Design a protein around this nucleic acid. Structure first.
Ligand SMILES: [Mg+2]
Lengths: 128, 59, 64, 171, 167, 493, 350, 33
RNA sequence: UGCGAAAGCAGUUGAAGACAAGUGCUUGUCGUUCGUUAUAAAUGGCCU
């Protein structure tokens, strides 16, 4: 069971009722330092949508990176999309590809739908 | 530093034992010594990697 | 988490914990283990507590 | 019969130690291995071994907590800035001491050390301390279990060796 | 055809009192220091420290007494051993239910339920050093006030008696 | 606890024609020497054995070059008229050459003085003399007489077989691997003729039509033969007897062709093809023979060859030019008491019961700017960014990294005109680049909002902003123009 | 070669008592053979040991007292000091010491109920009563120069004849105090003198691969069982149903119906232990009751381990495979493969 | 869930599912010791 | 704060009590209440 925590994914095994992993799927000031005082106003990138292809070998993630305040570029949210892979034995997802600003600039990825098994043996997806 | 460089001193007489060690006793470059807590066993290591063991009949 | 050594006022650190430290304790007859409570304040929707038991020997998570 | 005859060592026997109660003998050296033998005087078979990668063994010693006799532990060190401790058969519980709590300058290597017993008179509790040899006359004393830095002792000139004496006060 | 059932656990429980600090954690490490007892909102988990796995789980739903008592109540503390009397635990709840449970074994369907008699008190803390037990209780400017009582077990009546010490 | 993440270098979206893994390997043929020969260097061959010396045929001689020294070690000058080949044997011991007089001679390689066997193959010129790869003892010679006689070393008086049927000059001969009986010859008629020496022969089993004079035929694989003729090269399959692919990327007529397989490159197989336009380009057979790299030389290229698969040393690319220039490109490849003192370091616990490994891998050293950010030295981190000889990408990150941390104004408080100009100098340049334009926009906005007063009293700062205003104004024209192009480009669709 | 100087299973086959030297002193310990108890509680290693306080003192003979027969489990120890110690394992203290007048070392011991019989290097018999703790009679029989073994024939509920052997075997009548029959024994000293059934007792000698089956009533060798290598320990199942002998090279051999060409019989089933890595682990003792066989080998230096197998279904040649530590990469439960803390979150790396 | 059953999550962080003899005394004493 | 797109479109930020400071009056504060959808600044920066 995958929980999209803010800027991370928590992998939790409900059969054993114990956590199995906690991975940072995003850039940003997440564990580089302890935010204090005004730094605590910063917003880390938010993992909005997370989905798997049917075969389960590919992980598709969608991020919204928020700019810092009091700058010219303080009103242009950055939409990011990422494709990760892992072998079943391994436990950490390795980022394979990164798309910056899909569909254009400042246009959110509202929906993601992984493709069915018939179309490209489940190695495809739709973004809307 | 040098081979066979081990001696045993009796106390409180402070007199060194004469019968042992001998010329023929194998010790090599003595580099580690250890007395067992009981049974009076003496273990002597050397540069060759050999731990030679002796028993003191008195204990 | 900072261990203040009061004799000389020095200190040692264990940084990059998963969350801010709500609570600390020394748990043992000899202080073998440190019990910590973490918050993960990133999630404002809910309070996410994580209990951590660290081995004071090498400051490695004995039980999270 | 030789202790090493059962399983020979590939380097000099830098240190030896008899277990306080059990009939075991511990050997360590620059081979980076901790070989334990069952000294019976006729066979001397090898109970176990433990290879520490990149950790030359300059000295080793058993340790038995004075109060809790069930506690057994093996401390070892080398020309390195960390110390190892082995609690006492699928795996080995090994912990690394590598924190001096601000006195890192005074201590460059854990190679020379000894373990003694300290009584906290205010509480009457007894526990182990690991003693280390410092850069310039410094002797660093660490809590054996937690690894905390307790106190430091200084002398003038180059410290060369030290030893521990106990002096009973009362019951 | 279908049926609904709870499966997994939930957030760890916590002493959710603003006034108390340094006593938020209610988890306890066993006397032998080989396993850690942690109360959740809906269960009590016993983890083995050496192997880092949940050796045992005590679910409130399974036990009838716990089901009624907790399913609002919350464990205010766990004490190792059994006060009334080697793997027993005493659970003190906010209202006053004291339950003697057993881990490392099979949970008995009839635990030694007791009830400390409190008049308009919410129990905040209990604690002991050697055979002596004192309980702290909260009673009601938006600031809560406290009384410290002395708790003892009388075998003849099989009840917990509370005697006033401080306020 | 967890280890501190490393600052992640900024990577902008990919541009066209990134460096490909194939291009990276072939780019390593760096060191270039240009030797001058007497006449056009017609043929170049590599010894199949170590040290894999290669022989160049120029004018009336043959020269063998050392691989490590890249210089002449042996010269064969007995030949009276022009020479036309220097192919080695599979064993590499013997070297054969052809002459305009038609005489074919076999010499001990590395022993120019001795002449093993001399054959008068024909009265016409003998352009091709190649040893048979499967069978050592048999030699094939193609001549302007238009008969490709198949000689035997033991019997030099009469050819073992004489293949005919070519109505024009035969200048190309190839032996198919795994098919010793088969022999392939290509003439300027535009036909590639295949012969079966096991049979009676002298009549081709079947012909393959190229439609242009065939300058060289190479058997790439047991079932595939690539033939380069005219202005294109085509790959044929014998089992189907039809061309699978064709590439005409060349401008002039292809002359020579060579193939190397199972070498340590990312491309498992490579096909180098001279063009006679100064171009020799590498084709990858696994990918339908698409271009992957190319070189340019001064004049038309008449011969190209590469070091064999088992070079066992620095590889070599050799290009032959009609002007006589030879181009070489190369991918270069205490006391005994003290040892008895400390003898345990070598041991790796091969006999021990339990092996415990706890040393953390050594991480690469961190640069100055990364250390300052980790230690929260905001103002210094900006300074380390703006230093001489700092990679532009590396400079962009520390700027973005500070902005991400929310420390932009904090980095700019304790500054004056003296320490502000390095930033403005970079901003004067970085504003041009598309990737750093937005980051330059933010920082320049802050410094103006933070040092307006200091700007008035300082002249030097003013000239920086005047020049900066000109460049941003220049960018507005470019950015506007790109929009206009997009407007027109939309109309076409 | 073997750290275990002497060993002996209990009659039920559930507990093994073995003696080993720690430093210069012999220690006696008891371990549970079976993996788990009847109640289902997993058996645990027993740390308790009985230490001999004198280096010179040694244990020459180890004999069990029947658990069912007596209220307190006990094992009888012969000592070179010339006295016999009765040891209660639960108390972990020597309850009582039987002392012969002389100081000669005890060579053997055998027990039936209260009747206890020993012999010394002086070749003097003795009779002891456990219940009364008294020396009944001590006598020396002529023509018995040595007595390397003693076994009391199981006749009814009393002792009427004893079997003794030094190099040849002799049968002696207690009341008549004289020899009754003489058997041709081995050239080497006898080591094992067990009585399989009535009128059929086996014999084995040091440094010998041959076991002679003799007839008590008649005196002719019924059979000679032969092992591949030298024989160290012997255990018989039921009434001659099967015989298992622990060879000196470390293999266990099982004889199937040895009491049914005919003169010389070879072992039918051979059992071995080899670790997964490839090292062979010798077997120092074994027990076989009806259809289960118990194999005991030493791991570490003196830790005994046990395994129960159903020899009826085992093939002729069987090699048990056991996982022993060898180049075991040490995985601590609080670290992953790469040494990173398990609680730690994985960082982000493009 | 990809099985027939369905998993649901509750704001209390609870994941529910909707879907279709002297030896014997001696043995005890030795374990006690 | 509501709605909505990300742009933005509408709308708020009040009253009482108590304490401190300065001079009954002035200002500032609240681990005090009611109602409405409703700068910071104790020299203080992350281990081996
Ligand atoms: Mg000498």
């Amino acid at each position: 069971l995958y929980f999209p925590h803010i800027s991370a994914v928590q992998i939790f095994d409900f059969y054993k009722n114990e956590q199995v992993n906690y991975q940072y799927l995003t850039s940003g000031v997440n564990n580089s330092m302890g935010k204090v005082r005004f730094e605590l106003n910063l917003q880390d990138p938010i993992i909005t949508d997370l989905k798997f292809t049917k075969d389960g070998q590919w992980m598709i993630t969608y991020e919204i990176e928020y700019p810092p305040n009091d700058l010219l570029s303080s009103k242009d949210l950055t939409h990011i999309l990422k494709f990760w892979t892992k072998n079943d034995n391994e436990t950490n997802w390795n980022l394979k590809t990164k798309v910056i600003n899909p569909h254009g600039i400042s246009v959110p990825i509202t929906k993601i739908l992984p493709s069915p098994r018939s179309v490209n043996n489940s190695q495809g997806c739709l973004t809307a | 530093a040098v081979k066979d460089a081990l001696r045993l001193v009796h106390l409180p007489s402070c007199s060194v034992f004469s019968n042992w060690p001998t010329s023929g006793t194998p010790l090599g470059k003595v580099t580690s010594v250890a007395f067992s807590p009981s049974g009076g066993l003496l273990a002597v290591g050397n540069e060759q990697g050999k731990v030679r063991l002796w028993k003191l009949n008195h204990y | 988490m900072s261990l203040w050594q009061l004799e000389t006022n020095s200190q040692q650190f264990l940084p990059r914990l998963n969350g801010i430290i709500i609570d600390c304790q020394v748990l043992g007859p000899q202080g073998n283990y440190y019990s910590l409570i973490l918050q993960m304040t990133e999630n404002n929707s809910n309070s996410d507590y994580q209990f951590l038991l660290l081995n004071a020997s090498d400051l490695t998570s004995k039980l999270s | 019969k030789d202790a090493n005859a059962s399983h020979p060592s590939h380097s000099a026997i830098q240190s030896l130690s008899f277990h306080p109660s059990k009939p075991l003998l511990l050997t360590g050296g620059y081979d980076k291995t901790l070989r334990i033998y069952h000294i019976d005087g006729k066979t001397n078979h090898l109970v176990t071994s433990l290879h520490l990668v990149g950790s030359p063994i300059q000295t080793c010693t058993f340790y038995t907590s004075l109060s809790n006799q069930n506690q057994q532990n093996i401390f070892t060190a080398g020309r390195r800035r960390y110390m190892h401790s082995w609690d006492l058969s699928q795996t080995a519980k090994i912990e690394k001491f590598s924190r001096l709590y601000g006195h890192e300058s005074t201590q460059r290597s854990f190679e020379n050390f000894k373990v003694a017993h300290l009584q906290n008179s205010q509480t009457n509790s007894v526990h182990g301390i690991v003693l280390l040899q410092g850069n310039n006359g410094w002797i660093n004393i660490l809590h054996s279990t937690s690894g905390l830095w307790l106190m430091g002792c200084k002398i003038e000139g180059v410290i060369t060796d030290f030893c521990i004496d106990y002096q009973p006060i009362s019951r | 055809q279908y049926k609904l059932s709870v499966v997994s656990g939930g957030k760890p429980a916590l002493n959710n009192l603003s006034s108390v600090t340094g006593n938020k954690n209610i988890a306890r490490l066993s006397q032998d220091q080989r396993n850690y007892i942690i109360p959740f909102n809906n269960q009590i988990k016993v983890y083995s420290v050496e192997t880092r796995q949940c050796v045992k789980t005590l679910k409130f739903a399974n036990n009838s007494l716990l089901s009624g008592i907790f399913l609002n109540e919350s464990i205010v503390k766990i004490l190792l051993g059994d006060i009334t009397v080697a793997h027993l635990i005493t659970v003190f709840t906010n209202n006053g239910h004291v339950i003697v449970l057993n881990y490392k074994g099979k949970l008995v369907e009839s635990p030694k339920h007791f009830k400390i008699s409190l008049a308009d008190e919410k129990l905040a803390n209990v604690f002991h050093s050697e055979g002596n037990y004192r309980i702290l209780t909260t009673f009601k400017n938006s600031l809560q006030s406290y009384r410290l009582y002395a708790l003892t077990f009388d075998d003849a009546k099989k009840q917990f008696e509370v005697a006033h010490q401080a306020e | 606890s967890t280890a501190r993440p490393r600052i992640i270098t900024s990577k902008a979206p990919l541009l066209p024609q990134q460096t490909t893994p194939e291009q990276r390997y072939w780019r390593q043929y760096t060191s270039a020497q240009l030797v001058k020969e007497h006449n056009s260097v017609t043929h170049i061959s590599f010894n199949p054995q170590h040290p894999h010396d290669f022989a160049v045929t120029s004018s009336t001689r043959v020269q063998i070059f050392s691989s490590r020294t890249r210089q002449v070690i042996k010269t064969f000058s007995r030949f009276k008229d022009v020479v036309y080949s220097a192919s080695f044997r599979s064993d590499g011991k013997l070297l054969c050459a052809g002459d305009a007089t038609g005489l074919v001679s076999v010499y001990d390689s590395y022993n120019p003085r001795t002449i093993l066997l001399s054959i008068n193959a024909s009265t016409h010129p003998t352009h091709v003399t190649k040893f048979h790869t499967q069978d050592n003892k048999i030699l094939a010679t193609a001549s302007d007489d238009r008969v490709t006689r198949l000689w035997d070393i033991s019997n030099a008086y009469e050819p073992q077989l004489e293949l005919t049927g070519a109505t024009d000059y035969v200048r190309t001969l190839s032996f198919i691997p795994a098919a010793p009986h088969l022999v392939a010859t290509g003439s300027y008629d535009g036909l590639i003729r295949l012969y079966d020496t096991r049979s009676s022969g002298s009549t081709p089993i079947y012909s393959l039509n190229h439609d242009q004079p065939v300058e060289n035929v190479i058997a790439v694989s047991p079932t595939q033969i690539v033939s380069c003729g005219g202005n294109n090269f085509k790959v044929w399959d014998l089992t189907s007897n039809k061309k699978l692919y064709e590439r005409g990327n060349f401008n002039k007529a292809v002359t020579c062709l060579d193939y190397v397989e199972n070498f340590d490159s990312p491309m498992q197989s490579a096909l180098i093809a001279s063009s006679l336009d100064g171009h020799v380009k590498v084709f990858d057979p696994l990918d339908n023979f698409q271009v992957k790299f190319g070189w340019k030389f001064s004049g038309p290229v008449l011969s190209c060859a590469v070091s064999p698969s088992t070079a066992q040393g620095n590889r070599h690319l050799v290009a032959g030019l009609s002007s006589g220039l030879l181009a070489i490109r190369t991918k270069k490849k205490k006391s005994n008491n003290f040892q008895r003192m400390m003898r345990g370091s070598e041991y790796q616990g091969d006999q021990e019961h339990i092996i415990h490994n706890d040393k953390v891998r050594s991480q690469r050293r961190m640069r100055a700017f990364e250390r300052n950010i980790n230690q929260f030295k905001w103002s210094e981190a900006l300074d380390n960014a703006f230093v001489p000889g700092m990679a532009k990408e590396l400079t962009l990150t520390v700027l973005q990294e500070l902005r991400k941390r929310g420390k932009v104004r904090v980095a700019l408080y304790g500054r004056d005109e003296s320490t502000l100009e390095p930033l403005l100098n970079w901003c004067l340049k970085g504003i041009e680049d598309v990737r750093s334009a937005s980051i330059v926009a933010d920082w320049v906005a802050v410094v103006l909002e933070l040092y307006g007063n200091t700007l008035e009293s300082s002249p030097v700062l003013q000239e920086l902003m005047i020049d900066l205003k000109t460049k941003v104004r220049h960018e507005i024209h470019k950015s506007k123009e790109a929009q206009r192009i997009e407007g027109m480009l939309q109309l076409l669709t | 070669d073997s750290p275990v100087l002497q060993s002996a299973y209990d009659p039920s086959g559930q507990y093994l008592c073995y003696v080993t030297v720690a430093l210069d002193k012999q220690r006696v310990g008891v371990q549970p053979t079976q993996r788990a108890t009847s109640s289902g509680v997993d058996t645990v290693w027993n740390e308790n040991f009985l230490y001999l306080e004198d280096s010179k003192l040694k244990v020459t003979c180890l004999k069990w007292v029947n658990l069912a027969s007596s209220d307190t489990v006990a094992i009888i120890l012969g000592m070179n000091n010339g006295e016999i110690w009765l040891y209660s394992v639960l108390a972990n203290e020597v309850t009582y010491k039987f002392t012969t007048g002389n100081s000669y070392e005890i060579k053997d011991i055998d027990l039936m109920g209260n009747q206890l019989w020993c012999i010394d290097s002086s070749d003097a018999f003795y009779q002891f009563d456990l219940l009364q703790f008294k020396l009944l009679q001590h006598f020396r029989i002529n023509n018995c120069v040595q007595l390397n073994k003693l076994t009391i024939v199981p006749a009814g509920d009393s002792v009427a004849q004893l079997l003794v052997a030094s190099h040849s075997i002799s049968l002696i009548d207690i009341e008549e105090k004289k020899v009754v029959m003489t058997f041709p024994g081995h050239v080497s000293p006898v080591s094992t003198l067990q009585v399989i059934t009535n009128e059929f007792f086996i014999s084995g000698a040091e440094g010998d691969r041959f076991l002679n089956v003799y007839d008590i009533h008649s005196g002719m060798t019924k059979c000679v069982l032969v092992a591949e290598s030298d024989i160290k320990e012997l255990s018989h199942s039921g009434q001659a149903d099967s015989i298992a002998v622990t060879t000196e090279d470390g293999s266990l051999e099982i004889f199937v119906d040895p009491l049914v060409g005919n003169k010389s019989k070879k072992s039918s089933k051979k059992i071995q232990i080899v670790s997964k890595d490839g090292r062979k682990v010798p077997i120092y003792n074994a027990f076989i009751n009806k259809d289960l066989l118990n194999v005991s080998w030493l791991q570490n230096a003196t830790m005994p381990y046990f395994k129960n197998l159903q020899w009826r279904e085992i093939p002729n040649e069987y090699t048990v495979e056991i996982s022993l530590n060898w180049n075991n990469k040490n995985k601590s439960a609080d670290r992953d493969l790469h040494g990173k803390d398990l609680a730690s979150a994985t960082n982000y790396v493009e | 869930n990809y099985d027939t059953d369905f998993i649901f999550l509750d704001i209390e962080s609870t994941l529910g599912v909707v879907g279709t003899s002297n030896s014997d005394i001696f043995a005890e004493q030795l374990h006690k010791l």
